[PDB]
Amino acid sequence: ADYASLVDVFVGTEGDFGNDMPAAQAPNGLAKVNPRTTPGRNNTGYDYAQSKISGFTHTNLDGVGGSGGGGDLLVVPTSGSYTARPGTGTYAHPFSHDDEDAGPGFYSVGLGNVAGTDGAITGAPGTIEAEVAAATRSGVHRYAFPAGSTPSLVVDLETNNTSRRSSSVQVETRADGTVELSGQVTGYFYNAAYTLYYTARTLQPATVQTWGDDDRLVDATAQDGVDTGAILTFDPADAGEIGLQVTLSPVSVEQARIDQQVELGDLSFDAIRDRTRAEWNATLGRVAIDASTATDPTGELQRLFYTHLYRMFAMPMNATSTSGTYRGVDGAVHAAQGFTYYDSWATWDDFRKFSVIAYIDPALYRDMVQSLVYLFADAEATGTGGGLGGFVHSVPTVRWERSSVVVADAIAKGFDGFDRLDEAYPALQRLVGQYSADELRRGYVAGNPGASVQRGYDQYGLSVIADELGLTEEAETLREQASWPIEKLTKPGAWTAADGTQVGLLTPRAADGSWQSADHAKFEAAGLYQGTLWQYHWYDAYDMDALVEAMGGHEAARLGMRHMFGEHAPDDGKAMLHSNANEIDLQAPYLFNYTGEPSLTQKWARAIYTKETWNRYIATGSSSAVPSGGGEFTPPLKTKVYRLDPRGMLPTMDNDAGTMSTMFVAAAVGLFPVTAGSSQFQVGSPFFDSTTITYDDGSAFTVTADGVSEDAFYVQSATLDGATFGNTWVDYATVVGGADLAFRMGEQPSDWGTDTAPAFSMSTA
Ligand SMILES: [Ca+2]
DSSP states (O other): OOGGGGOOTTTTOSTTSSOOOOOEEOTTOSOEEEEEESSOOOTTSOOTTOOEEEEEEOOBOTTOSTTOSBOOOEEEEESOBOSBSOOGGGGOEEOOGGGEEEETTEEEEEEEEEESBGGGOEEEEEEEEEEEEEOSSEEEEEEEOOTTOOOEEEEESSOOSSEEEEEEEEEEEOTTSOEEEEEEEEEEETTEEEEEEEEEEESSOEEEEEEOTTOBEESOSEEEESSOEEEEEEOGGGTTOEEEEEEEESSOHHHHHHHHHHHHTTOOHHHHHHHHHHHHHHHHTTEEEEOOTTTOTTSHHHHHHHHHHHHHTSSSEEOOOTTSEEEOTTSOEEEOTTSOOEEOOBHHHHHHHHHHHHHHOHHHHHHHHHHHHHHHHHHHHTTSOOOGGGSOBSSOOOBOTTHHHHHHHHHHTTOOOOTTHHHHHHHHHHHHOOOOHHHHHHTSOTTOHHHHHHHHHHHHHHHHHHHHTTOHHHHHHHHHHHHHHHHHHEEEEEEEOTTSOEEEEEOOBOTTSOBOOOOTTSTTGGGOSSSOHHHHTTOOTTOHHHHHHHTTSHHHHHHHHHHHTTTTOTTOGGGOOSOSSSSTTTTGGGGGGGGTOHHHHHHHHHHHHHSEEEEEEOSSSOOTTSSEETTEEEEEEEEESSOSSSSOSOTTOOOTTTHHHHHHHHHHHTEEOSSTTSSEEEEOOOOSSEEEEEOTTSOEEEEEEETOOSSOOEEEEEEETTEEOOOSEEEHHHHHTTOEEEEEEESSOOOTTTTOOOOOOGGGO
């Protein structure tokens, strides 16, 4: 019933261990009411290890890198006074995790009172009780100040996790004495600027002063610049209850006002909070779990599951007004006709996540894909031919590579009626790019194996879209070019097995065709981004069949996969060639299904996600969080990859718009998308006795794992809708059609699935 209570929003909120936020937020909500720690923070604005909090920001990005995105509109409660633009140091309040409470839709904290004037502001007796909650587009605040205090709220419009580009504030005092503030914030993250409009109203009478770029605190009711803000001052009589309501719109201030009225009306703070909690319980309730003591003796695995399901519904964010409109990259307002438009993409990192969303919430997935299509269609409509990074985006956003694979994923899964797909296509083609004349002749990018395999997958994705558009010859060409990276860059005998077997591996190759020297296990060798050749070797997951053949045959692949996971030396951390910390080879644990050893896939799925494993690689060159260098743990570390702890992931292991969380959910369900852009999922090791996915029409997918335990993680046999089942993959249609997939589990590896019908490969389809 109350799934919300199982979510721990503090998981991954410490230091460099996930870069997630405890922010109050609704499912796929635009408004993200995040506490802000000081002097340290994680990328979202909050580091669990800190002991001071300034205030609450209203925009954000989940699990991203750099110094984080969003972080706009900082609201700081204070008993102090200002005569100039506030020093950010004066915002700091002591806090304790003992006086802090948060969950789906809400966050509460007891803040140490602060008082004084300007730079003399410091600790003062009493507590500012802070409560926030969130609706899709709105953040609501309720504060209690110590009796006798002159309550104040600073609205700081300079604050951003990366870069403030411009901001404005306009002040209105209404007949009842309450104040409304409105304007725009323009920020930047990674590739692009974005603009959001806001309205914020007090629920009690207030006076107001504003500041602009000259740091002067004045009575003027308008500011427009870069560093701007407002300071609200309330009557001491209202100390016991100070309320604020903030609403965001990518469209305009007037739309934000309309949204606030529709979304919040005259509802109380508690009602808004309760409603979002009910919305989370509906969302999380899409998956119902029965977890025995055998498999989850502490109850922590179930809590881990629902925490990560919660994280799965964060990005992309709802970027649609209550009037069914959105802002295009052309800078204009358009209709989201008969669907909700979502925006905020990090597709280079997160592309596999959508394949999972597809089987948990089909309708949400469809709207996401339709949105992605509109985004590229809008780019094309500008007629500039420019890439997406040259426009101002409607919400904070990241990057768009692999978009063709995501759209292809929906098409392959049987989704249709994607309006404006024909418009999206040429823009998707520009995103993917073309090999140069010389690259077309030789079949690859010289010295750049990474860019080559990436284009391979992009072109496969594009070939699916092309056929859907009736562009038959173009799809053929795309498929031909998509086969090149496997064929031309898999160097025969790059690694030699213990028995002499010659194993082909992804290797940089020169323009003239000679192979370039590389260490296949070295982080970022050969021009690679955030990985090794062993890891990028499996990248072209749309053609495992051709890859197996290029590697030197079935036995070569089988032995390569075992070497990949250090099976010959299970107690040597240096033998672990797979990385758990990054998304590059996320699919690797499930590739044993393709080499005739499904039991090893089962072992690794259960181990990585629910046990301690050997970890050799971090997600970046070095980390101050753990002894590390050259992209590795130095020494390799035996540890849990996922923890029910503020240190939630491995150090450096960013969640990346909920990707790592989504893969945890997929591992638990036991169905993993090795081939994004296909309709298939690979069978892993389902964690729970019973997992039921209920769809909107009342039908349900049910996967059972009879006798599953911490020790019994191997499949012994299986049935599908009552009949003997021996494949290690299942089609999307089977899942959403509401099948009953029943596994019998055991403590020893079995030969179940060793006679599987072949999974999808482009070359053999
Ligand atoms: Ca990453």
